[PDB]
Amino acid sequence: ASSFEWFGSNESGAEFGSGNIPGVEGTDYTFPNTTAIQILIDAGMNIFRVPFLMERMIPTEMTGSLDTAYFEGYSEVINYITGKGAHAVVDPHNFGRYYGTPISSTSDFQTFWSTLASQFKSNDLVIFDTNNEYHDMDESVVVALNQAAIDGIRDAGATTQYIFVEGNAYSGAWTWTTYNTAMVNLTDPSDLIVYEMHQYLDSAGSGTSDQCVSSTVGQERVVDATTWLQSNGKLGILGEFAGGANSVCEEAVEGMLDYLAENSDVWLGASWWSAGPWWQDYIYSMEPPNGIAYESYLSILETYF
Ligand SMILES: *[C@@H]1O[C@H](CO)[C@@H](O[C@@H]2O[C@H](CO)[C@@H](O)[C@H](O)[C@H]2NC(C)=O)[C@H](O)[C@H]1NC(C)=O
């Protein structure tokens, strides 16, 4: 069958042009292309993470109502993914901020998630991702925000879906034990928490260059996090990762994923960053037919499918 339970791609677009809230569809932002998603489904991928902006989903206050247009464009892509039998990760790509302000209301954040999860409650293939890449916030608040998210999700009766929780410091795997050990104190009625981390292999780990530090940096940056999951009896998914289209980066990726496949009892899978229809020139574009990463990594990544 497989090495991992899941392996797939992020599908970007709905989170673009975040300077313009609400912005205009087709100008500031778009929704992912279902035809292009099917090409990746055809290839063997079975999980897709679809970013969006909290402010476009629920404008003005996070206790408010849905924007019907933006939600229905987003819903359309989520339900295509689950319609084909693959898991769809619902990802408010917000860095723990709302209208630019670090989120500090656990009740307004729990109300946000109740409203959102209530529209997916009976879709067993939806995955909930509490927020993309918390950073530069207090660890206590971050953990409470992940707990508030779990609480609103279940309250609304979405109890069969996995919840992806993310840590501080951009939820990096290589820094996980430095900053996010507190995240062990998270609880779920359904007991379906997966710890989602991100790892890039360039100098800063910021994922902004196509050069990797070395052919072994990828394995190096996931060891500690692998031990932490095994130690505390938790589960993980690498929700984002990428490398440049050169052999040093490719070898780093392979040895990173080798090490995670060797530890698949804690690692449930991985998700490449990123596919989507507006990436063009992007160094990590997984979008068919021409994206650089589609051209250089798809063959590589299928060996782990
Ligand atoms: C959505 O994806 C499909 C397939 O990747 C794109 O369709 C291709 O479009 C090119 C350029 O317009 C055509 O020449 C190909 O014949 C199409 N291929 C297939 C398999 O249909 C489609 O354009 C994408 N939508 C976008 C980018 O907005």
Nearest Cα residue to 146 out of 101, 115, 100, 112: 112
Peptide bond into 274 cis (omega under 30): yes
Q: What residue spans define the domains of the chain? A: 1-305
Cβ of 293 less than 6 Å from ligand 1: no
Relative to the CA of 288, which ligand 1 atom is closest? Answer: 5
Task: Give the distance (Å) from ligand 1 centre to CA of residue 34.
Answer: 10
Are 256 and 199 within 8 A, CB to CB?
yes
Nearest Cα residue to 117 out of 85, 86, 152: 152
Q: Please give the Cα distance from 295 to 288 (Å, whole number).
A: 8
Q: Is 284 helix (H, G, I), strand (E, B) or coil?
A: coil
Relative to the CA of 277, which ligand 1 atom is closest? Answer: 27
Solved using = X-ray
Q: What residues have CB less than 8 Å from 165, skipping those under 6 apart?
A: 130, 146, 149, 150, 183, 186, 193, 194, 195, 196
Q: Please give the Cα distance from 285 to 245 (Å, whole number).
A: 10
What are the angstrom distances between the C-alpha of 49 and each of 107, 124, 142, 211? 25, 15, 21, 25
Q: Active-site residue 262, yes or no?
A: no
What are the angstrom distances between the C-alpha of 156 and each of 51, 121, 128, 293? 21, 7, 13, 38
Task: Give the distance (Å) from ligand 1 centre to CA of residue 35.
Answer: 8
| Resolution of the experimentally solved model in angstroms | 2.3
Tell me the two tokens of residue 278.
């507006």
